Write a protein that binds this ligand. Structure first.
Ligand SMILES: COc1ccc(Cl)cc1C(=O)NCCc1ccc(S(=O)(=O)NC(=O)NC2CCCCC2)cc1
Lengths: 133, 845, 133
């Protein structure tokens, strides 16, 4: 085909576009979705623990919003611990800071929504029966 | 809380880099829509790239990862903004744009917080520049939403992507691509790759856009001529052309002057680096890389815009003088020949003068900046040197004029010879029926000796030109350095001063030659426009092996070894200057003088050798061709058409004599200079050698794909030139019949068709030349980047030797131009050798 | 059928092949998928804790990359604790070793992908309505 007046419907079919793709591309874009979201929230958590000052190592006169947080690495470990719902519990989010409550209550719902779509679309894929063609 | 604000800046780049990856991966797993501010957006994005490089420099100077991460993140954020804008230009959306707008607003907020917290207490200027750039990009996005209806009520009233450059099959899409590719000619990758496999033709070629046709340029020119004649000549037609071609020419000229400025700027940062290490240098190295690439890119865009304006002008004035050919009177043979010369030489003169127009504006500023810069580096002595080089420019012109005179004389003789041939190749049976052929061959050889006699003086002038070309660079350094230290003030000449002077000497020698040709072209174009106004208002190695074996073993080695020795002297003089620098100064200067004398003597010897050898080869080849054609059977002469047999002698001989020696000399000088420069930058830094062999192999792939197209397009040009001119002549003779039949419309249609077919070819050819130029230059800048990056560390931290970096930097700043000379002269030599091969094809009859 | 020129499309229909199978075979191959992945990552974790030297029982001068790991058994318990997203948290992966972070960040994504396919295909199975035939 030549000279297609693309009005954008090619991407407007957002998931009916990528459910057409091969397996390596679809697996790549799924891992990239997951890693993108995880890194986003790990950054925001690192920042919030830095900003509260709980990141500054100090004994007493405070309780960290997230108990036992030290560096970026442990923060990314907390992000993957709460996002993908393993819940290790070595670092505890506490009832002292409601801002952390908000970040958790949006983290989890976005996690659940993107998990729901990334399951429905892979299943809609496994009904590729062109192989039977 | 500095680290806190650094992190707050890192966040939005991360947000954008994370949203870009799904869409970019879907898009990575033919209608171009452009938006207002596109070119402004790309310009601002390149300015962002520059400021981000500066921020990385600051972060290196300070170091604390979290303190310089913001620059490294904005870098990928701007590149991903470019990727987004490419994905939107390819397919339009209202949402991706808002996705950019969010990021712009958040980055502006973070930068504002940084600025406030700094005000309460180098960083200041960079942060401010970033603020201004992000704000202007925000305003661009606001303009884009204001244009269409993304946030507005439902409908866009969207443009309906431009059919001028995107509708029905067309291939030369210059005006309809991304403003980065408008500079780097990336759209030619597909064409050249397809061209490698399938032979190009007019069916495989595109059709010219509506932006440049016979009709468009004729319309603009006639509108200007009308607006100028309604207010009522040579000056009139001139001003009409000027006002008609307007903005494009001055745009090219200003591109050109900015490139000239940055080119004069390069050697000064070289000087600064050389100073710093002997007593803040990595920054200067990356700045040198950036400035080289940008200067050369702007130079190339300037060339192309000028060439396109010239092609427009040629098409316009051609169809105009054809429109005039319809209304002329019958009372006005000689006029037909004058008309067809008015299209074959006068119009080409006009168009090539329009090529060289911006060079005439950019040359004076170049020589002025050069002289003022070299004065502040070498002092009063510099002035003396600045005279010598300049003195070569008028002399050159004089030399050129002599050439022309000689040419005229030679041409005369040549013409007569052709006459004395046309008889023999027609009375063939008559001639051989009584074997009077040798009697006429004696006369033909008598003419040939006179022709040979003219050629000696012509080649002597060519030799003088080539000799001065490389003699003045040596003489400048000789009479400047000997006249600076051991004459005036005994000032300690740091390596930086000498090597910066060397760089500036080459950067000033390159433009000087062009001024002479520019002056000649300008006066000739003035005469041709006066004339127009008066009228309008009434190949394997075997071919080269045989070519050089016709010379004999006597001169082959005498040429090759002399060239090798001249280049060895030209490198050894600088090698000894390197040891001269650090400080027996008098003995040093005397050795420098000895080397300078050896160089010029050897150059004169080589030039005379090339001249003598070329003349002897032409003689022997012509005599052998004549003798082998004499002894052919009659049925052979009857079988072969006369055009091919006559044509070889008419052109092949002429072409070879006129262009093979000069082009061969230029190719040899270019290839040996390139090899010498590579060896220099290798000896300076050993490890750099191992880094340069990869890149050079890249050039191999760039070679093949070029030639297999550059040849092809070339011949196509020739073809579109042949029926055009002939057509003109047909209209002139049978003019009464054509004005009687009232067939003027159809013939004008045919001539617009022919001039379009000519322009598409002469346009794709310049596009391909620009492609090869820009890519070879990008690699020639990569090599100097890597060379400087290795030299600053290896030759300072561990080796601690300062005389090295000078030679390496000075040769790597210029290796690219020698590379380009090499490749272009190679293409020309190949087409000329392919022309020669048919002479040997005729020799075996 | 006799003399089928098998060009491999019989297995190239990877999941549209096994969604045809009976229930015991499909349940067998699903438990074998899960146990295969779990044992693979339990082995690699055992090895990484051995290699860091955190496996060598010692008091002080170190913190194990995974707190409270002693033998292969507890390592396999950690593998099933993080893979299938129960997250017991008796053994804590720490922010001292980024290599353990990498092994976790690939463990979880492969776990999620194989869980997604092993749900989509069993559902694509429960649309076996031949019984209605
Ligand atoms: C030799 O360079 C220069 C170096 C420095 C300066 Cl300050 C100016 C020039 C220069 O040349 N002045 C600009 C004008 C110009 C003319 C020719 C060329 S060109 O490259 O030789 N030729 C082509 O591009 N296309 C040809 C054009 C003719 C029809 C067939 C295709 C490039 C540019």
């Amino acid at each position: 085909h030549k000279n297609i007046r693309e009005q954008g419907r090619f991407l407007q079919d957002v998931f009916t576009t990528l459910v057409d793709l091969k397996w390596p591309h679809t697996l790549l874009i799924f891992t990239m979705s997951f890693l993108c979201s995880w890194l986003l929230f790990a950054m925001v958590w690192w920042l919030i623990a830095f900003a509260h000052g709980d990141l500054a190592p100090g004994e007493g006169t405070n309780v960290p919003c997230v108990t036992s947080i030290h560096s970026f690495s442990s923060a990314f470990l907390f992000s993957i611990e709460v996002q993908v719902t393993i819940g290790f519990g070595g670092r505890m989010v506490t009832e002292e800071c409601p801002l952390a409550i908000l970040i958790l209550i949006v983290q989890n719902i976005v996690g659940l929504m993107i998990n729901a779509i990334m399951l429905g679309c892979i299943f809609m894929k496994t009904a590729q029966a062109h192989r039977r063609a | 809380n500095g680290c806190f604000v650094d992190a707050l800046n890192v966040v939005p780049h991360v947000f954008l880099l994370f949203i870009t990856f799904p869409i970019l991966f879907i898009g990575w797993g033919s209608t171009w829509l452009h938006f207002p501010g596109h070119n402004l957006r790309w310009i601002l994005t390149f300015i962002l790239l520059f400021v981000l490089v500066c921020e990385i420099a600051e972060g290196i100077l300070s170091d604390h990862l979290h303190l310089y991460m913001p620059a490294g993140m904005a870098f990928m954020a701007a590149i991903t903004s470019v990727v987004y804008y490419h994905n939107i230009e390819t397919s339009n959306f209202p949402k991706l744009l808002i996705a950019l707008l969010i990021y712009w607003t958040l980055a502006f907020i973070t930068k504002t917080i940084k600025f406030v917290k700094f005000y309460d207490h180098l960083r200041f200027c960079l942060t401010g520049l970033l603020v201004i750039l992000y704000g202007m990009l925000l305003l661009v996005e606001v303009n884009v939403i204001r244009v269409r209806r993304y946030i507005f009520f439902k409908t866009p009233r969207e443009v309906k992507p431009p059919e001028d450059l995107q509708d029905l099959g067309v291939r030369f899409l210059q005006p309809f691509v991304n403003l980065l590719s408008k500079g780097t000619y990336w759209w030619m990758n597909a064409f050249i790759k397809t061209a490698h496999k399938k032979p190009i033709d007019l069916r495989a070629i595109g059709k010219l856009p509506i932006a440049m046709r016979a009709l468009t340029n004729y319309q603009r020119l006639c509108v200007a001529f009308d607006a100028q004649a309604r207010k009522d000549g040579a000056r009139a037609i001139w001003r009409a052309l000027c006002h008609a071609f307007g903005r494009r020419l001055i745009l090219s000229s200003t591109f050109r002057i900015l490139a000239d400025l940055l080119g004069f700027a390069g050697p000064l940062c070289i000087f600064g680096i050389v100073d710093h290490l002997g007593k803040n240098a990595y920054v200067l190295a990356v700045l040198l890389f950036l400035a080289l690439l940008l200067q050369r890119t702007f130079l190339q865009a300037s060339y192309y815009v000028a060439i396109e304006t010239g092609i427009n002008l040629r098409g316009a004035i051609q169809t105009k003088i054809y429109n005039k050919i319809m209304h002329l009177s019958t009372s006005n043979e000689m006029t037909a020949g004058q008309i067809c010369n008015l299209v074959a030489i006068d119009t080409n003169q006009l168009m090539w003068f329009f090529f060289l127009c911006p060079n005439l504006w950019a040359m004076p500023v170049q020589i002025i900046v050069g002289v003022i810069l070299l004065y502040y580096i070498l002092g009063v002595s510099a002035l003396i040197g600045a005279a010598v080089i300049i003195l070569l420019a008028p002399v050159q012109y004089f030399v050129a004029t002599k050439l022309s005179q000689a040419q005229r004389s030679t041409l005369e003789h040549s013409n007569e010879r052709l006459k004395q041939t046309n008889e023999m190749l027609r009375g063939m049976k008559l001639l051989k029926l009584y074997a009077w052929e040798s009697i006429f061959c004696s006369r033909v050889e008598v003419t040939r000796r006179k022709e040979m006699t003219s050629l000696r003086a012509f080649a002597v002038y060519t030799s003088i030109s080539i000799f001065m070309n490389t003699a003045i660079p040596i003489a400048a350094v000789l009479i400047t350095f000997v006249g600076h230290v051991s004459f005036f003030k005994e000032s300690d000449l740091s390596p930086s001063v000498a090597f910066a002077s060397l760089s500036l000497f080459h950067i000033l020698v390159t433009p000087l030659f062009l001024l002479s040709s520019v002056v000649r072209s300008t006066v000739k174009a003035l005469v041709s426009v006066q004339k127009l106004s008066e009228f309008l208002s009434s190949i394997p190695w075997r071919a080269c092996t045989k070519y050089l074996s016709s010379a004999g073993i006597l001169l082959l080695s005498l040429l090759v070894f002399s060239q090798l020795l001249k280049h060895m002297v030209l490198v050894a003089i600088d090698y000894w200057l390197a040891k001269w620098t650090d400080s027996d100064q008098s003995v040093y200067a005397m050795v420098f003088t000895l080397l300078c004398s050896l160089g010029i003597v050897l150059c004169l010897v080589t030039s005379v050798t090339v001249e003598w050898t070329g003349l002897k080869v032409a003689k022997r080849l012509h005599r052998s061709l004549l003798n082998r054609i004499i002894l052919a059977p009659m049925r052979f002469f009857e079988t072969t058409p006369l055009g091919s047999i006559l044509n070889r002698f008419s052109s092949d001989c002429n072409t070879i004599d006129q262009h093979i020696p000069s082009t061969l000399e230029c190719l040899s000088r270019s290839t040996l200079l390139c090899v010498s420069a590579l060896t220099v930058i290798s000896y300076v830094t050993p490890v750099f050698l191992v880094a340069l062999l990869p890149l050079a192999v890249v050039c191999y792939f760039i070679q093949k794909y070029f030639r297999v197209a550059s040849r092809d397009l070339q011949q196509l040009d020739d073809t579109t030139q042949l029926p055009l001119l002939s057509h003109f002549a047909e209209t002139v003779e049978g003019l009464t019949t054509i004005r009687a039949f009232r067939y003027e419309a159809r013939f004008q249609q045919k001539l617009l068709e022919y001039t379009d077919s000519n322009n598409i070819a002469s346009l794709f050819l310049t596009a391909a030349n620009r492609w090869l130029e820009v890519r070879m230059e990008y690699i020639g800048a990569c090599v100097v980047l890597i060379a400087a990056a290795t030299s600053i560390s290896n030759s300072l931290h561990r080796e601690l030797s300062a005389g090295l970096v000078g030679l390496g930097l000075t040769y790597a700043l210029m290796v690219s131009n020698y590379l380009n000379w090499m490749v272009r002269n190679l293409a020309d030599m190949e087409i000329q050798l392919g022309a020669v091969k048919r002479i040997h094809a005729l020799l075996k009859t």
